[PDB]
Design a protein around this motif. Structure first.
Motif, PDB file in Angstrom:
ATOM      1  N   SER A  57       0.823  -1.206   0.000  1.00  0.00           N
ATOM      2  CA  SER A  57       0.000   0.000   0.000  1.00  0.00           C
ATOM      3  C   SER A  57       0.860   1.261   0.000  1.00  0.00           C
ATOM      4  CB  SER A  57      -0.932  -0.025   1.207  1.00  0.00           C
ATOM      5  OG  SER A  57      -1.833  -1.117   1.130  1.00  0.00           O
ATOM      6  N   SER A  96     -11.339   1.064   9.550  1.00  0.00           N
ATOM      7  CA  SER A  96     -10.637   0.039  10.310  1.00  0.00           C
ATOM      8  C   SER A  96     -10.725  -1.315   9.602  1.00  0.00           C
ATOM      9  CB  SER A  96     -11.231  -0.063  11.714  1.00  0.00           C
ATOM     10  OG  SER A  96     -12.560  -0.548  11.666  1.00  0.00           O
ATOM     11  N   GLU A 144     -15.275   4.787   8.010  1.00  0.00           N
ATOM     12  CA  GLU A 144     -15.921   3.857   7.098  1.00  0.00           C
ATOM     13  C   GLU A 144     -15.908   2.470   7.720  1.00  0.00           C
ATOM     14  OE1 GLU A 144     -13.993   1.441   4.994  1.00  0.00           O
ATOM     15  OE2 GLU A 144     -15.882   0.625   4.242  1.00  0.00           O
TER      16      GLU A 144
HETATM   17  N1  LIG Z   1      -2.313  -1.361  12.921  1.00  0.00           N
HETATM   18  C1  LIG Z   1      -2.431  -0.781  11.611  1.00  0.00           C
HETATM   19  N2  LIG Z   1      -2.169   0.482  11.429  1.00  0.00           N
HETATM   20  C2  LIG Z   1      -2.272   1.035  10.228  1.00  0.00           C
HETATM   21  N3  LIG Z   1      -2.642   0.290   9.206  1.00  0.00           N
HETATM   22  C3  LIG Z   1      -2.909  -0.979   9.373  1.00  0.00           C
HETATM   23  C4  LIG Z   1      -2.809  -1.539  10.576  1.00  0.00           C
HETATM   24  N4  LIG Z   1      -3.126  -2.798  10.457  1.00  0.00           N
HETATM   25  C5  LIG Z   1      -3.422  -3.022   9.204  1.00  0.00           C
HETATM   26  N5  LIG Z   1      -3.288  -1.901   8.544  1.00  0.00           N
HETATM   27  C6  LIG Z   1      -3.497  -1.689   7.184  1.00  0.00           C
HETATM   28  O1  LIG Z   1      -4.445  -0.619   6.985  1.00  0.00           O
HETATM   29  C7  LIG Z   1      -5.488  -1.038   6.096  1.00  0.00           C
HETATM   30  C8  LIG Z   1      -6.836  -1.040   6.842  1.00  0.00           C
HETATM   31  S1  LIG Z   1      -8.052  -2.042   5.928  1.00  0.00           S
HETATM   32  C9  LIG Z   1      -9.278  -0.945   5.146  1.00  0.00           C
HETATM   33  C10 LIG Z   1      -8.549   0.146   4.329  1.00  0.00           C
HETATM   34  C11 LIG Z   1      -9.472   1.319   3.945  1.00  0.00           C
HETATM   35  N6  LIG Z   1     -10.879   0.872   3.900  1.00  0.00           N
HETATM   36  C12 LIG Z   1      -9.054   1.901   2.584  1.00  0.00           C
HETATM   37  O2  LIG Z   1      -9.488   3.024   2.217  1.00  0.00           O
HETATM   38  O3  LIG Z   1      -8.255   1.243   1.822  1.00  0.00           O
HETATM   39  C13 LIG Z   1      -5.157  -2.448   5.576  1.00  0.00           C
HETATM   40  O4  LIG Z   1      -4.753  -2.389   4.198  1.00  0.00           O
HETATM   41  C14 LIG Z   1      -3.993  -2.951   6.464  1.00  0.00           C
HETATM   42  O5  LIG Z   1      -2.943  -3.503   5.658  1.00  0.00           O
END
Ligand SMILES: Nc1ncnc2c1ncn2[C@@H]1O[C@H](CSCC[C@H](N)C(=O)O)[C@@H](O)[C@H]1O
Length: 288
Positions: A57, A96, A144
DNA sequence: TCGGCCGCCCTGGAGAATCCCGGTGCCGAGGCCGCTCAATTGGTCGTAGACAGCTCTAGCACCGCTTAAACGCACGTACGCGC
């Protein structure tokens, strides 16, 4: 469902002579959908801070925004000092991870597991980025989540964020079947889906050449939703980006496989739904 | 929605075996010489077989009935065959 009751705070419109660019905090960014929508609406971005863990990402953001994104690592590493030293924010966004928030899991772990409780991290950064009393600066926030949640989970989230979750379905503006809850205090939070003629409503406008859509729209039988040369074929990733409103060939940034692109595009926001949501910010902030 | 293990495809490099290539020895095959005994030649009979003729046996050819058995068709279930 009327369990809680609170009026949404409506900020006064600022005229063009006191008009400033946006400072955006994006907690669970993933694929950088928010800054993509902001650049598509023609809004000057003074600072964009994304706190993303996953390196794919981060690679998507570094390719598609060219070092504009200020990267943080995990959201647990962010303190109140990091919020107060990075300037006051104008837009806070995030969704989240719904690994344990979704009720599609039979053995779900709930809100208070390390995938769900990251929401509270959001609330903590919501508490730090919010201006104190006496400040009339327009501060906006957006959370969201999926529709497949429990009643007590959605009730606790709505009580904690103190806003009415509007339900938005991607089928009214795009070619996807996903309903999402949106907490926030944007003006016109529950105004109806103004479908843009540039948005691809049907599925067949999102397909490539030589492929016929079996369904009218796609979901989020042992068959495949697209015929290709009289043969059922898997829905393509660039076609999935066209369904989700992304620009053509968006999430092709590194040497990741098909499954990684599916995992990134699944968790991502819907571009038209956001474009609808971010639309009234144009009259409150700078334009380009 | 999640990543933890698990079979598939490809490819890479150790790894034992085998092919190739000379180098050296060795012992049996090629060649020369005596000689000795059987191959050859000449001649003589004796009879085995080539040849002409006659015969008469059965082998081929044809036809007519006569049913015995082959050909074809449906069918069903038991064994061939794959997993
Ligand atoms: N503790 C954390 N802190 C920040 N990001 C995290 C995290 N744990 C997972 N992530 C990441 O953050 C994302 C949240 S999932 C949903 C992403 C959001 N709906 C969007 O607009 O894309 C996931 O891709 C995951 O890889």
């Amino acid at each position: 469902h009327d369990q809680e009751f609170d009026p949404p705070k409506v900020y006064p419109p600022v005229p063009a002579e006191k008009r400033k660019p946006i400072r955006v905090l994006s907690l669970f960014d993933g694929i950088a959908t928010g800054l993509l929508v902001l650049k598509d609406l023609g809004i000057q971005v003074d600072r964009y801070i994304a706190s993303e863990v996953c390196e794919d990402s981060i690679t998507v953001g570094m390719v598609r925004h060219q070092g504009k994104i200020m990267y943080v690592g995990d959201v647990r590493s962010v303190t109140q000092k990091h919020i107060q030293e990075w300037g006051p924010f104008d837009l806070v966004i995030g969704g989240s991870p719904c690994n344990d928030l979704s009720i599609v899991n039979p053995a779900r772990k709930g809100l208070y597991e390390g995938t769900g409780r990251l929401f509270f991290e959001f609330y903590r950064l919501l508490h730090d980025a919010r201006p104190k009393e006496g400040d009339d600066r327009p501060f906006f926030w957006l959370f969201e989540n999926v529709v497949a949640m429990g009643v007590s989970d959605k009730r606790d989230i709505s009580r904690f964020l103190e806003s009415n979750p509007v339900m938005i379905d991607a089928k009214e503006v795009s070619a996807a079947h996903r309903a999402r809850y949106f907490w926030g205090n944007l003006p016109g939070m529950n105004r109806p889906l103004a479908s843009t003629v540039n948005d691809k409503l049907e599925l067949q406008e999102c397909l490539e050449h030589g492929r016929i859509a079996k369904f009218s729209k796609v979901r989020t039988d042992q068959h495949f939703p697209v015929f290709m040369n009289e043969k059922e074929d898997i829905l393509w990733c660039t076609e999935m980006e066209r369904v989700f409103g992304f620009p053509v060939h968006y999430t092709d940034v590194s040497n990741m496989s098909r499954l990684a692109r599916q995992r990134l595009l699944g968790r991502s926001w819907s571009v038209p739904v956001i474009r609808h949501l971010f639309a009234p910010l144009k009259e409150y902030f700078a334009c380009v």
